[model samples]
Target chain A: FQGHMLLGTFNITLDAKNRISLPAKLRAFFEGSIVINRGFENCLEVRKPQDFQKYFEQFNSFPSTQKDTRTLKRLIFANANFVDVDTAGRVLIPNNLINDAKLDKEIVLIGQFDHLEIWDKKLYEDYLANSESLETVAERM
Target chain B: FQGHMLLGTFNITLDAKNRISLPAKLRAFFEGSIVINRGFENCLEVRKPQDFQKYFEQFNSFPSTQKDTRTLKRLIFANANFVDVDTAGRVLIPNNLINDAKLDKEIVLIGQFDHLEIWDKKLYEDYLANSESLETVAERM
Candidate 1:
């Protein structure tokens, strides 16, 4: 499911240009550009071009007839985008990604083995606290 | 700002055909079906038709001259879906959603203030374990 054994947590800011510095440890695996896409959570998933190219190949080839399939494609094909890493080891986050994720000046980056996630600090925290154990609320199927 | 004071959680299965039973307490707020869409977190958000219609009216009306604006629209409009609740009070989950959220036979449905969220059991548990407190996470933003 992944190529990089990415780990560790790094915090960064979305500068005026909406760019953030990628830690050297993480950027070492990527060159030229990275694929940033709408992640399952509010965070954006970061993947190197090689793996993303491989991943998309499978998703793109699946046949579809329902609105669900078409919608997921649109979100992926349209939501996933490329951003080049600049000389300073920073990459510019897209405007749409920024707006959609509701990213703020402050952000958190964490390596999730296969990819990285960028999250809004508040939302991420709320996510953490709000997450955990939902069964107390569960009922019979 | 929601009409229903929704609370509690329910566990259900994705029948061979991909549907779930919304607890009667929560289902009472909705009429034939519900509007389900991508949530900020790794879950699906379900909103009743009347309220969702109000939300889209505002989102759809937002002018878009930038890629960010357009992309969000595509994600929102393309990602949000309406599923009919059968006579049995179950709604057919979308296939792409089943794939995207990685939903297994065990699933969880939880009440959120204005809407509801559908999460895969393992991920929901993982989310809880991995989530952190709000104040520290919120300091930056």
Candidate 2:
């Protein structure tokens, strides 16, 4: 998935219970087994069977944590979920995660190079409204 | 795009003057027109022209004075941007968005379902590190 982008722009809504319809275009790639992980940011990260395994391994190759790592560890593992897409390509999202990220009925799904992430449609849109100007952001590159 | 399982993660970047970069992968999803809005979560959400029109219809359908509803709409439309992706796959991340999300160098471009999120790499890493266990996170099924 290096340098390859898989997800496209899509509009979706979450039911009262937080269930969303995975885009038809994205479902085919993530079908079968998928891994759900706490996103690096406030959202969630998902991977296909093979990609999940690879990412899981890559995460473990690092050194173990001792201090200030306990909380993070729990959130990453105890909170992370492994879900399988049903025949209808629907996955149940836990309420806890929703509340944590403040997601709601409307949503946006983006395909990262190797993984997919979920976002609240409204919240995500608001974020884009505040990006920096070209000059302030150019020197960093 | 409803539910807690998905949070749009935009793969974007900030330059020295704080200009942001939208990932090439996500650009493919948007067509001739787009919508940019201020995200409640301190970023921006972007939508295609068609999606924006549909969303506007829904926004008008909602009750007035709802919690964050009016504020959300005002911010969204106020900060909203519409631009075409250049041949180089680069779109300008607005000045307001840069400050809102605190974008900087060493960025992390993440793909959420519909849009990509741009994050400052160090801050994002710290956020990821502070959120979970490195091993448990990796070892999970």
Candidate 3:
């Protein structure tokens, strides 16, 4: 999984043509094809097909007390999407996704070991600025 | 527009079959077809039809200097998927996608303001850790 996952943070923006070039090193892991899913956070998730399968399985087993489980079922099954990168190391985002995430030209890409997240550049910067004293939000060892 | 969107997050495991139980509360917000695309930042971005349309308009307005724009167009639109949730509150994650993201048993979902992001447990946790110091990076903010 070491090489399979490309983790780091970088700045990104969409071009006039709705194209996005993945960072060079990250593109290697995404070479032939990659799976993209509706990430829980505002960011997008990328993985090799094999990796996505491993994670999708978990969504299959949720024991919720809420009768609303049916709703959840519809949401994930309906809203989630799977996509691959093209020869140019880019993936076109549907208008709905772009709008859903409120993605603008400036943005941030955060690497999460085996996965990564995309954030609005300004929003991400604001979040970063506001996160200084919020150390409690950090994960514990 | 203090808050112009909704968000959700959940957790589950990838069964050997690659099916995930959609969270009910998250389902109610969407209607009609859902668009899924390749997310460069890592996770997936789900777009509602209306929201998708807005995004498409933005992409359609890009200038040529941005090469990434072309890449995203090909990656997202070319491979974008429109899926529906079945009565079982489940939708099939394309086999190719399951493999691409390397999804495993332990999974987590977070509600982004407008969309959702699915992630592996470890990946999500690592993301939280790295976010701790983002404030310093916001020099321009």
lDDT of 1 by residue, A3-60 (tens): 1334334577889999988877667778879999887557777888887887666555
Residues B1-141 of candidate 1 have per-residue lDDT tens digits of: 233766767787778878888787777788887777666555878888666656655642443323343334333434555678898888888776777678878888888767888999888888878767777669866
User: Number of the top candidate by lDDT?
Assistant: 1
Give model 3's DockQ, 2 decimals: 0.02
> Model 2 chain B — which ten-residue stretch has the worst lDDT?
B63-72
Candidate 2 per-residue lDDT, tens place, A78-126, comes to 7677787777777777777777667777877665435666777776676
Q: Which digits, one per residue and each the tens of the lDDT, describe model 2 over residues B87-112? A: 66555666666676666666665545
Highest TM-score model number: 1
lDDT of 3 by residue, A105-125 (tens): 976788887776777787677
The DockQ values of the predictions, listed in order, are: 0.02, 0.03, 0.02
Off by over 4 Å in 1: A1-141, B1-3, B57-63, B137-141
